[PDB]
Amino acid sequence: QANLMRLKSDLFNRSPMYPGPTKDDPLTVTLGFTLQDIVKVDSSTNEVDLVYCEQQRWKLNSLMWDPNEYGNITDFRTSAADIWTPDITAYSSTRPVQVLSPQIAVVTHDGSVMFIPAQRLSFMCDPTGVDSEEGVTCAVKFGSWVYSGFEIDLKTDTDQVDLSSYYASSKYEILSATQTRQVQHYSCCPEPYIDVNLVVKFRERRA
Amino acid sequence: QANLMRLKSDLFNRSPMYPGPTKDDPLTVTLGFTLQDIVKVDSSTNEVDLVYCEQQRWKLNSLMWDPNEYGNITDFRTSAADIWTPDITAYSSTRPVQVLSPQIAVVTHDGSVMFIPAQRLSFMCDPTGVDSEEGVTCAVKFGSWVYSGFEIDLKTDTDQVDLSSYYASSKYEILSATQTRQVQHYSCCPEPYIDVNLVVKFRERRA
Amino acid sequence: QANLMRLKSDLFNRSPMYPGPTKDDPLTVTLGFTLQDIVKVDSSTNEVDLVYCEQQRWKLNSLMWDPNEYGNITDFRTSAADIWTPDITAYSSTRPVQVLSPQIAVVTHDGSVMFIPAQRLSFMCDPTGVDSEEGVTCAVKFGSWVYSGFEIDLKTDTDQVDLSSYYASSKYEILSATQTRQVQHYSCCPEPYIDVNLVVKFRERRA
Amino acid sequence: QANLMRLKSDLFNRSPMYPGPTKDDPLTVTLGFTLQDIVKVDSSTNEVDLVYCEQQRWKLNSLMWDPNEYGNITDFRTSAADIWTPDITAYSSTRPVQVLSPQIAVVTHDGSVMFIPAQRLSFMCDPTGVDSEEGVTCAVKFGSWVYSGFEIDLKTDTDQVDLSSYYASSKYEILSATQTRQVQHYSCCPEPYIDVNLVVKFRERRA
Amino acid sequence: QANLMRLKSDLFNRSPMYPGPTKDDPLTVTLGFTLQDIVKVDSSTNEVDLVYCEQQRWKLNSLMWDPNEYGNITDFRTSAADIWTPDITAYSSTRPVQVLSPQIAVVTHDGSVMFIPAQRLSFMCDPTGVDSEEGVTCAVKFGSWVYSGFEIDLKTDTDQVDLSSYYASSKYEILSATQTRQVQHYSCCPEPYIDVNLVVKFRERRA
């Protein structure tokens, strides 16, 4: 307990709160979605509700340590409010995202962080054709709200969304689920922003 | 990281928290709207729900710095709770506005600040005629709640709302969307308050 | 900025937080309702939802200053969390009141404060007869929850509720709207509590 | 203002925050109910919503003072967050209780406290027979969640609920409303826990 | 009060906040479920709502004391925000869990802690067959979100869920309710995570 208490104290005191990435000190966040359920489809407003886990990984030099200096501690768990986190946002939500899991991250001696928030998202989607054989396709972009491609870059380990935890008895069955990196420009800003586009084809499951 | 940490420290210590504008030190906020979706229309209460982005720009001498003094840093991202922000409010909302994006602003070396919150608004609007060819027209005023024209002035870059991000498969199609600056008087107060009037003409989209 | 920064600093440091009124140091709050809309009527639970602005005015010796001592500053805007505010409560609400406007007050050199919160209230009201020619009458009392008449007194500038901002295309039209001061006794307490009774007669508006 | 400011300062500084009652230092809380309205009855989930006021009273030696030492101040109003309050909980709620009134208590020089929160409760209740002549009976227990009889005891002044403020035009009329002290044992714990059982018989009101 | 005030002061000052368990300092949490009610079943989204109490027990060397050193105090009640608590989470919730009881734990001189939060959970469950004689079976896993089996182990005193407080007049009757310990692997992580699987068989109750 003493060693971890010391490590946590030293990582916090060694330097003030990390000010986020810069053009000169950029960061690459690895995103990966685990789609658990398509809960609701609303045809009167064209909103669809998803339950998923957004897996996030990044590395920070400021969170690095030598295990030999801190009782061979290789990693630890900490509140996500105690460390810097990326501002990964759904670009087309219709409601504030609901967080379903504790806000705790895992920090490793190499400075790498893993943070997996489970969330419920309500986003823009016309479900017309959900009841058909072909089903309906809907997409939502995820990325930083304020950091461009020069400050925050995004990466995926695979183009395939994890469906190994998708609720079998859900009202909707998944025909396809894709997560692909893309670089866009916006009216507000001159720099190119980067995002992970979550595209999911689904239909009503027969009882 | 060191340079930005220093800049942020020096900008905060240079003077206590900015007390907002005054008659003697007025401010001009540039407002612009990017209408993403008309989510819901409720004819039983006469409420309409919009999803949009509110681009806000202002300039503060207190936030100015020389990039040559801080490792050629030209701008930075910071929590909107760490800086003064204008109190732009919808004058005719029926629910507390829901914030859909992170509360982070961008501050530039000339002292200018850009903050683009994404929000969901539920406001007063009779939708009667939404299903007709002509559609229905509804308006909502945005402006400071406590600062008059002598303290906060508002400006737009264009009278035409940004519709380049409007959800194509929305239940409602946009016939027209306008943003106009106007100056009004109220019973409470002797000074003229200024606002940006968002007027949007819309109808039900055919499948 | 310097003068206002100084005034605000001196007003906070000159004395600890104001402990509220007392029998020995009583206060008079001026109440005034601007009814903007009757949003919803629910006949299955007998609840009615209103959108209104509650103008509150009071004077405090502790908030007084000499403009000649602070660069001819006659007034300033401040967060309502930074100053004492009265606990004006609806005595018959069915839901926690939703605040629709920023929590900012205007303080003047004579120690007077003006605070205008915009709110949505869900209160006890049987709407039977709303569809009739005569319409329905419903009332809700507003007053301090813990302070009696000896500590907080209430006053109105007119017995007429401001209807100049009432939404024209509302589902309900106003036949009459009154705000009267009244003094009552309760089982709990020996002292007389005072309230402002909001009485509004309304009916369904024809297209 | 000076005397009250001083009293409140001295009451806070004389000793650290009160750690709650103990077997050695027990406390007796007096509960009372003022049932204002039976808002909703839901037969599809078996939930019933009440709007009531809970009068709570207890005495603490730590909150005692001599009025002659503090400008003949006999009592004062304070935020309920500034003092210890009991964990009186509804044992069978289906939703987190909504607080409708400000969280302010009244403290007297003898150390006695009075706190009357107005709340909306959604609790377990099968309404089958609400439309009959006999009506339906439903009950909800109120007690401390963590303190047993040896630490917190409960008392009522009357066994009759206060119905003098019950909304006349409510959808439901009260046939009977009782508040009775009872002592129970639970599977978790060996000590006897004490509660106040709120039993109310009601039916649908005829127009 | 003095002795407890001292004990609480000494337990807080003797060492900084406990950093949670480690591979080298693991912890075993005992889980128990008291199912109070199956509130709602939604066949249009496949969500089911439960009201239950989750009894949690763990022991910490850092919370140990000698009663003879602190006026024969054997235990005390404290805010759960003042002590470390495990991040026991429902792995398949569709909404953020609603807490229905005060967040207070009971700490004993041997360092053991008992914490019983009453909660409302909305989780993934197809209710098809709830109206049949056989009823429907639904399951939800509870475990730590970030700690593996090497850091947090789980244990149950019985496989049988406590039904002695189940609301008799609920819309749904319980046919069976089980709580069994299980060890799983996940896509994210290499270490085995452990959970308590809550399996409940229920059907619609006949009036």
Ligand SMILES: CC(=O)OCC[N+](C)(C)C
């Ligand atoms: C800044 C602007 O015009 O809009 C950005 C929001 N987005 C990502 C959906 C198009």
Ligand SMILES: CC(=O)OCC[N+](C)(C)C
């Ligand atoms: C720069 C800024 O604040 O945000 C706009 C949203 N975005 C990222 C897609 C263009």
Ligand SMILES: CC(=O)OCC[N+](C)(C)C
């Ligand atoms: C000063 C104040 O609270 O304002 C009330 C109405 N308004 C918003 C137009 C000026």
Ligand SMILES: CC(=O)OCC[N+](C)(C)C
């Ligand atoms: C006189 C006063 O309180 O202002 C209300 C103006 N309004 C409704 C548009 C906010």
Ligand SMILES: CC(=O)OCC[N+](C)(C)C
């Ligand atoms: C004195 C106190 O706690 O409040 C009781 C309810 N009241 C005063 C509004 C009628």
Ligand SMILES: CC(=O)OCC[N+](C)(C)C
């Ligand atoms: C304790 C007491 O008598 O209060 C009732 C609260 N009231 C009448 C506002 C609804």
Ligand SMILES: CC(=O)OCC[N+](C)(C)C
């Ligand atoms: C351990 C436990 O919660 O037992 C029963 C409490 N009760 C009846 C409120 C549900």
Ligand SMILES: CC(=O)OCC[N+](C)(C)C
């Ligand atoms: C002891 C504890 O934390 O919780 C038990 C619930 N109760 C109040 C009925 C006995």
Ligand SMILES: CC(=O)OCC[N+](C)(C)C
């Ligand atoms: C490991 C972690 O950080 O959280 C992921 C969800 N879990 C634990 C059930 C696999």
Ligand SMILES: CC(=O)OCC[N+](C)(C)C
């Ligand atoms: C990232 C990963 O594989 O974790 C899933 C956790 N679970 C099954 C609760 C949904």
Ligand SMILES: [Cl-]
């Ligand atoms: Cl301000």
Ligand SMILES: [Cl-]
């Ligand atoms: Cl940041």
Ligand SMILES: [Cl-]
């Ligand atoms: Cl107060």
Ligand SMILES: [Cl-]
């Ligand atoms: Cl306590």
Ligand SMILES: [Cl-]
């Ligand atoms: Cl932790």
